[PDB]
């Protein structure tokens, strides 16, 4: 157990040969073991500082942005009032850097969708969020027959209402999600084309997210939807060094090779602050 | 039905709230969890693992980016020359930014505890010498000579078979916790300075190299704690990904 | 007492007179798949002595301007020995590993190495290994100064000349294919460059030896 930090015991001076706490051999590969009460003269301190804020749940159970959907009136992206978005977390840096500290995670989720006009104004309009598992029919238009949601879960909500939220279980075939996959997903020959599938893990492709404005004709307002994600019941394994350089592509550790930068800041000389 | 009342806190989406929500999949059972080695149960578990410290963060160009991990040591005229100095502030930008402790501490506003810096000598077997490492508590400026630096807590390091020594920076402070130090008003939380001085010399016989290097590893003690989670100060994107 | 060492398994033996103890990866010895973890229905084969032995891969030279090298596991052994033959004749594979790195020099040389094991080493932009191009960022956008969080050891030429790491099976599945997934990668980077004066021997080779432990195979078919 470790509910609080360790105390400090009273120590005195020592002058004896043979026992040397200070000298070490870091070539072995293990951290130090010399403490404060073994290299200087210390007093008695009763530490009562809590360590409950550094747990995995306390560090990951905070909402963050992961998605963005645009439904414009005039444009080229989604001019038909419907959109399809594949579920990915690696789209934004703040959450990605946090979740990429470890290799395997197992967790539930709580998704919250906030919708408003591009100017921030709220107007009366109705929508339908539909969760499309892999292998289900994906809608292709605003009046697609697949919108009957006979089996797939769906949510009807209005803009003027408070943002809708749902709870999500752990749906992976594996024992945990993995953000790094050193290998290929097919038994092929890997000549050149397969290299575009390097690291593509099928165990992380959880489905598709579909949104439309309920109606037959075109709507009257442009709309934007923001998807926020929060983690709970989190377990982690095998931590790895944190990210250093900028991100370039989703689900790819690629970095700008010509512009490489140090981790921290720099100074002029080593003998001067 | 039952008469109720609404308090002035409704309809707000609070990111840090802990709440109950309606599940989407009724009667769903997840895949069983097998035993996978290397489980983390607390961010403090991996806050006590030594990592390489960038004391010599002078160079900047692409081809010499690896030279920041060590600083050189050679023979002098035996007058107690200076080797290297830096500030022992984990959260403040500087040499500590290259460690796992430094990166993790950026996610938390306040910290408390004792640190620990380990130096390893990577020279030839026939080269011997002694060095003095001193830690100046807050208030005293950078020492101008060894005889002024020896007043604060210090340790004498002797080269030999055991090639590593550890300097422990005890938690000496006026407040129970310290916020992250920065230039200006927030210098109130500065922890001090660290200096390395030549004790006698770097002695080497004929036929052996004249220049060696030292590698420094930093970590935290068993009473290290952090609180008041926040967001990091660095964003690793320059637009859409 | 932790200065001499002998490791034997199968029909091979390794001796060293200057060691730096033994690092057990994540504090867990390799073991077999328990009856509750298994998912297959066919009984697996455990060749035991015929695939658990030390193999020597290749020799790489250490120069005063070297960058570093890395290998992939278990990709190196798929064309070597009975372990290679069984890997291509079966679909599911699991095993542990014991890795030994040897590099020796005289008392007048100097330099240091960083031996580490990093699971799921995805590389951004065989049995002979590759040479890093940007060792500072590990060729994957992560700083090398934090590599010590992984199981690691050091080779200091003034103290020792070998490093030993024992790594269990690391994956999210009880069994996996050996021809499409590489569980981990071994890294050897010179942090402190080699140095010597003219007249000393200028060739300081580095050789890698390793041995699978507690192997298992299932899903027999034709060789692929």
């Amino acid at each position: 157990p470790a509910p609080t930090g360790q105390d400090t015991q009273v120590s005195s001076h020592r002058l004896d040969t043979g026992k040397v706490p200070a000298l070490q051999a870091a070539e072995i590969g293990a951290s130090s073991n010399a403490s404060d009460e073994s290299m200087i003269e210390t007093r008695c301190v009763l530490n009562s500082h809590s360590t409950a804020e550094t747990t995995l749940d306390s560090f990951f159970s905070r909402a963050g942005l992961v998605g963005e959907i645009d439904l414009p009136l005039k444009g080229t992206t989604n001019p038909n009032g419907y959109a399809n978005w594949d579920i990915d977390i690696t789209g934004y840096a703040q959450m990605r850097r946090k979740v990429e500290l470890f290799t395997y995670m197992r967790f539930d989720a709580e998704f919250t969708f906030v919708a408003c006009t591009p100017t921030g104004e709220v107007v009366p309009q109705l929508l339908q969020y539909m969760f499309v598992p892999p292998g289900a029919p994906k809608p292709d238009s605003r009046e697609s027959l697949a919108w009957q949601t006979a089996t797939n879960p769906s949510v009807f909500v209005k803009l003027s209402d408070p943002p809708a939220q749902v709870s999500v279980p752990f749906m992976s075939p594996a024992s945990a999600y993995q953000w790094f996959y050193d290998g290929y997903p097919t038994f092929g020959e890997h000549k050149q084309e397969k290299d575009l599938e390097y690291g593509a893990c099928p165990n992380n492709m959880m489905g598709t997210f579909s949104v439309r404005t309920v109606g037959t004709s075109k709507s009257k307002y442009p709309l934007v939807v923001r998807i926020y994600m929060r983690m709970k019941h989190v377990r982690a394994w095998i931590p790895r060094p944190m990210r250093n350089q900028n991100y370039l592509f989703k689900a790819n550790p690629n970095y700008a090779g010509n512009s490489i930068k140090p981790t921290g800041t720099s100074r002029t000389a080593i003998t001067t602050l | 039905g039952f008469p109720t009342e609404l308090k002035p806190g409704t309809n707000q989406f609070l990111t840090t709230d802990d709440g109950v929500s309606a599940p989407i999949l009724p009667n769903f059972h997840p895949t069983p969890c097998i035993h996978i080695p290397g489980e983390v149960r607390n961010l403090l578990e991996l806050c006590q693992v030594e990592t390489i410290l960038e004391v010599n963060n002078v160079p900047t160009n692409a081809t010499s980016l690896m030279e920041r991990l060590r600083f050189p040591v050679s023979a002098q005229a035996g007058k107690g020359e200076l080797c290297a100095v830096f500030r022992a502030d984990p959260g403040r930008n500087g040499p500590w930014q290259s460690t796992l402790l430094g990166q993790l501490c950026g996610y938390y506003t306040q910290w408390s505890g004792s640190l620990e810096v380990t130096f390893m000598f990577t020279g030839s077997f026939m080269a011997t010498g002694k060095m003095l490492i001193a830690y100046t508590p807050p208030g005293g400026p950078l020492p101008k000579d060894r005889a002024t630096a020896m007043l604060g807590t210090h340790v004498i390091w002797d080269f030999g078979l055991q090639s590593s020594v550890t300097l422990v920076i005890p938690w000496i402070s006026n407040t129970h916790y310290r916020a992250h130090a920065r230039d200006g008003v927030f210098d109130y939380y500065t922890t001090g300075l660290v200096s390395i001085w030549y004790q006698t010399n770097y002695v080497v016989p004929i036929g052996a190299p004249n220049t060696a290097y030292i590698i420094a590893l930093a970590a935290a003690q068993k009473n290290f704690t952090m609180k008041l989670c926040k967001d990091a100060s660095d964003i690793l994107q320059t637009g859409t990904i | 007492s932790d200065r001499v060492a002998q490791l034997t398994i199968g029909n091979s033996t390794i001796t060293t007179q200057e060691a730096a103890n033994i690092i057990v990866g994540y504090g867990e010895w390799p073991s077999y798949c328990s009856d509750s973890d298994a998912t297959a229905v066919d009984k697996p084969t455990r060749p035991d002595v015929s695939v658990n032995r030390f193999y020597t891969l290749d020799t790489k030279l250490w120069e005063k301007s070297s960058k570093g090298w890395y290998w992939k596991f278990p990709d190196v052994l798929t064309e070597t020995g009975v372990f290679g033959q069984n890997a291509q004749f079966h679909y599911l594979y699991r095993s542990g590993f014991c890795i030994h790195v040897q590099c020796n020099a005289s008392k007048f040389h100097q330099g240091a190495l960083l031996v580490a094991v990093l699971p799921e080493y995805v590389i951004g932009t065989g049995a002979d290994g590759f040479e890093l191009q940007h060792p500072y960022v590990l060729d994957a956008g992560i700083p090398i100064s934090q590599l010590t969080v992984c199981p690691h050891q050091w080779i200091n030429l003034r103290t020792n000349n070998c490093a030993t790491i024992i790594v269990p099976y690391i994956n999210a599945l009880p069994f996996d294919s050996a021809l499409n997934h590489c569980n981990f990668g071994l890294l050897v980077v010179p942090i402190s460059p080699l140095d010597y004066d003219q007249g000393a021997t200028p060739v300081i080779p580095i050789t890698i030896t390793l041995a699978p432990m507690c192997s298992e195979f299932a899903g027999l078919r034709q060789a692929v």
Partner: peptide
């Protein structure tokens, strides 16, 4: 944990158990 539905994964995060094993990563020496 507080729950209002028939599914355990719809409950709150709750309070975990404070346990640490720092020797797993810091002192893995045999």
């Amino acid at each position: 944990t507080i729950n209002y539905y028939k599914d355990s994964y719809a409950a709150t995060a709750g309070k975990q158990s404070l346990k640490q094993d720092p020797d797993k990563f810091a002192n893995p020496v045999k």
